[model samples]
Target: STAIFSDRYKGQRVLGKGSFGEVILCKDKITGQECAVKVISKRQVKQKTDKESLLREVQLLKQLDHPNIMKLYEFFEDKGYFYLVGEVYTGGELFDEIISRKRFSEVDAARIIRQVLSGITYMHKNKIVHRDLKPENLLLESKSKDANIRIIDFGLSTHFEASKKMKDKIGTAYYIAPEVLHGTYDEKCDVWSTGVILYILLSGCPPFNGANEYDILKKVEKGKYTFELPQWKKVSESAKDLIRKMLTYVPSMRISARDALDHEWIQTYTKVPSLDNAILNIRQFQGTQKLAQAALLYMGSKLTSQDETKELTAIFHKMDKNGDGQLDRAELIEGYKELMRMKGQDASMLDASAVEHEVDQVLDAEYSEFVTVAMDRKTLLSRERLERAFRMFDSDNSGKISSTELATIFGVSDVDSETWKSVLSEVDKNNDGEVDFDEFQQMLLKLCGN
Candidate 1:
């Protein structure tokens, strides 16, 4: 609809560059928020289908939204390039942790797979098939251990139907399943890739290996791979069998998305968040850590600006009613009634130490500070998320972040001591006291990048 990308997204800096134009971290001009925009060279595109694919990706991403999946914001293009805007991820290579780039252990892989499986289940149930399924597309928004896995790169994604099959054979070679009938690769292609993903995570190697990509394609086309890789010895045979169900060459027999979720292997390894899901809103109101508040405040604003975020919109409206900027005590109590009104939620489960502060939430399935921090009966705080984030704040000084690390993490330093800002009454100890994980944990939840 627009002729220019810059009219909306204002580029801040280069996130990465390749034969494809480049990705830039940008400020959303209208919303006044941060988002990442990928600029693809329209002229450099060699294939005409690439144009159709690019347009289709925009159409498809708008239809997809989930806690475990990447969020696509607004998209536009100009004469020279097409710009797709989405959230940014901050971690190693991508997820902001060492774990993403390495081969995960069985236990770790199981945790990751469960989230991936859940997202895929959601996708498949809706008749959407993500043609690309690989580690690079799996990402964390930050460096913290409890960060949510963002399923991204939906350019090759498409819709599906039980009666129809796609004639074009397309996808990463290793991830692509064998020919379905004559040349079509249907929805089952995702199942095969999920199997491939689990295999690589457990073995630190692909199930089908080759000296080069062409050789790898040769092996995959044959539809045979050995379980004899060195890393498989440590992996449970139970886990191995699940992969068997997923990778079955018989399309109809291939494991369904919902079926994979029910698999005993996934069930054995993953569990729900440590905290009670119902208590998310109350804990969010009670969290008081300034370190956590900085990030939560930012998240709160972003959530309010976006459209699909229907859950927290009502609560945010209630808290901001005085027309003042922050959540005040009277507002908190009034809003507490909103949570109560929705559920009373058992009357006995009513709940914060929070005043004039931003609130957080928890995901119903898993506890993540990412979505959990935005104040509502819907969000939750993970002591694990708090636990990991708290440790990330300070190198020493016990619990203090009197220096660079906190600033590095959230771009805000000087919480209590030193030159930290204050509206009126002073708020810290040790001059400019360091952040407390115990307090920060009490506070909180990633989207995209790299």
Candidate 2:
């Protein structure tokens, strides 16, 4: 009466085997659907060995169903054995394919990168973190070299937001985020991993190469990776910007999954009318059908805005906790830790002070000018010029800018008097009826570049 999978099920083929168990490719007896049956030993899992992570993988896979992501269909246990049946992907690992081919064309890389981001986005939306994200775990849905991505190997994955932290270190050492190595990190760690994968994809080599794992991690902590080679010459600026954001030393500064979906590079193709409609018509990848168009629209809308200097300054201030109007490492680390905690995750092992120091080492050089610029405004924009601009625009000696006065000063025709008047009033931090010299300087400096 015992049901042996090979005997009970039809169309059997051994796909591959790993340390804990083997995966067999087979067709369902009734529906004739193909699946990958992963067999694991109960004793191995019950003892909470390295393979214990397989249980979490099974749980996560069963709960998730997305086209770009591989699906789990069933879990059956018999005679101390656990069987996880999942979607049978036709293609081999991306790692082998890329390594053998030497490199991917820009179009091919972008297509794969988009699918990977989509899968990761899906995982994050469900509060799951794939601690281990690398080229090895990604496979093509079909044998086509350009088939959409199917993320596999969830053994090191978990939906731990509710609980905060997992007890063990679960990712490949080289690709691990710096925060994870420091013992204080969360979902952002996945973004860091994604960054590494993207870097490797673009350059055909890992950004950081060390004599060993320890050396690689040391370089990561030092944040001393480089891409100053000929290979990067042809890489699109949008792709480069996405990598920079994803791999930022300050985890909090890294773009979120939703925001990343709107990144400039990804949006470029999302806006093509033909591509957008074609994607929407395909039911399998429907969730992000509008992503392509939205990305283009998003970029187009941004291209029109030349006034982001003020907001950029504000972001700098928020990261500068010491009120020095500049971030040393400590300020950056604390900011990152605070963001992690705010995401309903624990900050227990995170050493805020230590992180700050490391961050300073990583970010200090690039930010030094920004900090200096903020504190000593004279270097970039003269306060005197700002004051003069403000006074010219605020015709009212009444201390408050009236609509008529604003229109006359700013040289606008039929402007909404109330709106301009209110805006000028708010910019006057001191609320001195006519914008004060300092307020005027700030307002002009913000509105018009020095």
> Model 1, range 1-450, lDDT digits (tens) per residue?
545666655556556532233467787678888886766544444333545666775777777788877788777765544566788876533222433233334666678788888888887766667666765567786777677787776443332111111111111456767763246776777788889877766654567655334556778888887787554566677888999999887888888878888998988877522212212211221121223533443343344334223443456465565655455446544554454444311111211322112232122221123224433332223233445545543434376554344433332211232223231113333335345554332222121000
Please give the RMSD to the true structure for each candidate, in Å: 19.0, 24.6
Give the 10-residue window scoring lowest on summed lDDT in candidate 1: 161-170
lDDT of 2 by residue, 1-450 (tens): 655554445445567533245577767777788888766654434433344465556676698888777788877656556666788887777654553453345555667778888888887888777676766578878877557778875533341211111111111445778887687787888888888877766665567544334556788777657668666776777888898898888889988766777888877744311222222212111111122222222222232222233443455567765676566544545554554343221111122443354345445443445433323431222233333434433334444443333343332211234644555666754453454445533443343332
Instruction: Give the Cα RMSD of candidate 1.
Output: 19.0
Worst 10 residues of 2 by lDDT: 161-170
Best by TM-score: 1
Off by over 4 Å in 2: 1-11, 18-20, 29-31, 44-60, 99-103, 159-171, 269-450
Q: What is the lDDT of candidate 2?
A: 0.55
